[PDB]
Amino acid sequence: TIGKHVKGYHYIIANLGFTDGDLLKIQFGGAEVSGFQIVDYDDSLVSKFI
Amino acid sequence: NSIQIGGLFPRGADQEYSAFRVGMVQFSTSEFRLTPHIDNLEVANSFAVTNAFCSQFSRGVYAIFGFYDKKSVNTITSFCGTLHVSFITPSFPTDGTHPFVIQMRPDLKGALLSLIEYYQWDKFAYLYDSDRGLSTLQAVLDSAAEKKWQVTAINVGNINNDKKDETYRSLFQDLELKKERRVILDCERDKVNDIVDQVITIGKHVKGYHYIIANLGFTDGDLLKIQFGGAEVSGFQIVDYDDSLVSKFIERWSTLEEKEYPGAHTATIKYTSALTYDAVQVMTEAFRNLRKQRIEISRRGNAGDCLANPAVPWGQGVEIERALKQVQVEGLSGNIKFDQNGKRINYTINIMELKTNGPRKIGYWSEVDKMVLTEDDTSGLEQKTVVVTTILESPYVMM
Amino acid sequence: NAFCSQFSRGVYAIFGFYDKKSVNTITSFCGTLHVSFITPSFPTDGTHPFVIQMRPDLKGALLSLIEYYQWDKFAYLYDSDRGLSTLQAVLDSAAEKKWQ
């Protein structure tokens, strides 16, 4: 809303639910966004569970 | 005593219909009361427009209120010119001077050019839609040719909803091939809102970007979300809320029951509905003037076939058009006057700028007052030139 | 009026012309009444049904001819009485190909 998601800003999400939140709306802003996740969707076990 | 009028309302114009009904209630008089022949069709369909026009002609309405689309403006103009039935419409004015067509919407091309010159713009992008035609695009291209501008016109309405997000992203990324920072949004309010959503999603609403909303509905949109971004946003509005009449109407407008008057339980009214209300006021004043001039409209409602060969003009249609063009009243859209072509004259358009606290007026424009700013924050210190004294001494001060 | 008279006659197919001020009416009438319209006029901007357009789309040839001469700066003298589809095409190509 205040336009601080533009390129030049860096954000770190300090939780293990980085992609489980609604981070889509800042994907195209240009600011670098990072975080952590404990759920690895690339695992066969996680794929079967999904 | 009742007077027949025809209504061509596009489907979904709930607020326009509500304002039409409010105007009918306000301006009705006991000596003559209006009766509408409301036809709700797809206004873009030329066949539907012809069918509605013929249905209203068979009922013998002396005047027709409604709207037209880019694919139906020619039909309305030709039918009105042939059958001598005056058309009252808040739609975009015709590029050519077509008789029996009355325009409530003022010309904003001159105001747009004045605003562009005010910001001393020379290089800017132009995102346009065909909804109101390409007359504004033609005018801005001619002004670019005369004033040596670098207008980069991009069509914004040809995209589809299935690829809305990706098309606009590439559109704004193609702008960075020119590093464009100045953009004018020449489209209706929903398209402007979609463009603002795409901008705020991609973060081009930050300070350094400048936007001009090329319509008379600047605050009728959702510009609140772009208010805090930092990019300068400007536009035009024909509805001025500082007027006592507009304030009283808004007080009456907001208190109405929503189920009875859909789209009316709002603190703000779109310029389309306001001009719909003012059009009812104008044509009621036209009939009042015609009756005061002791002219009669007793032509029977059994007009007959619309497509008779040859066509049948009626003399009283010219009298009704003359009365309509003779109307000079004060409405929600300010002063209302018409020229020989039915286009509005002596109108005053307000120019708004979007600040942190909200939109505010900065100036006004007219055909005799080109971009006259309100001179807020009156001078007297640091603008009344400070008296600088000095001594003739080289190399400091010398003739 | 002419289209209505011919439709009342019951013609199986219709041949005719149009301009920017009557193309929409013809297209709408043909789409509604389900009558083919054979026309040598300029192609319609949209994909309107029931209108048969023999005139080839010259926008592609014009753009390829501009690209053949390696043009990047030119004037465009156009008549408004034949549709602005070509003008919009040349403007969007200029935006895409960095022309002036």
Residue B355: what are its φ and ψ, rounded to 5°?
A: -110, 180
Q: Do C80 and B138 touch (CB under 8 A)?
A: yes
Looking only at the bridges linking them, the beta strands covering B63-66 and B33-41 are: unpaired
CA distance B12 to B272: 13
Q: Which residues of C touch B178 (CB under 8 A)?
A: 98
Tokens 């020619």 identify what position?
B74
CA proximity to B332, closest of B77, B106, B151: B106
Per the entry, the structure determination technique was cryo-EM
CA distance C29 to C41: 17
* Buried b / exposed e along C50-79 (16+ C-beta atoms within 10 A): bbeeeeeeeeeeebeebeeeeeeeeeeeee
Where does chain B break, by residue before each gap (C–N > 2.5 Å)?
none
Q: Is B377 exposed, middle or buried (0-12, 13-18, 19+ CB in 10 A)?
A: exposed
Tokens 């035609």 identify what position?
B133
Residues 6+ apart with CB under 8 A from B331: B245, B274, B277, B278, B281, B282
Q: Is A33 exposed, middle or buried (0-12, 13-18, 19+ CB in 10 A)?
A: middle
Q: Which residues of B touch C95 (CB under 8 A)?
A: 152-154, 174
Q: Do C32 and B50 touch (CB under 8 A)?
A: no
CA distance B309 to B11: 32
Looking only at the bridges linking them, the beta strands covering B349-354 and B359-365 are: antiparallel
Instruction: Give the DSSP H/E element, type plus range, for residue B66.
Output: strand B63-66
Q: Which residues of A touch B206 (CB under 8 A)?
A: 3, 6
CA distance B396 to C38: 83
CA distance B7 to B63: 9
Stated resolution in angstroms: 4.8
Q: Do A30 and B230 touch (CB under 8 A)?
A: no
CA distance B9 to B39: 6
Long-range contacts of C84-89 (CB under 8 A, 24+ apart): C84/B134, C85/C42, C85/C43, C85/C45, C85/C59, C86/C58, C86/C59, C86/C62, C88/B155, C89/C59, C89/C62, C89/C63
Tokens 């012809």 identify what position?
B50
Beta bridge partner(s), residue B213: B185, B235
CA distance B247 to B242: 7
Tokens 């400048």 identify what position?
B210
Instruction: Extract the tokens encoding C57.
Output: 């789309």
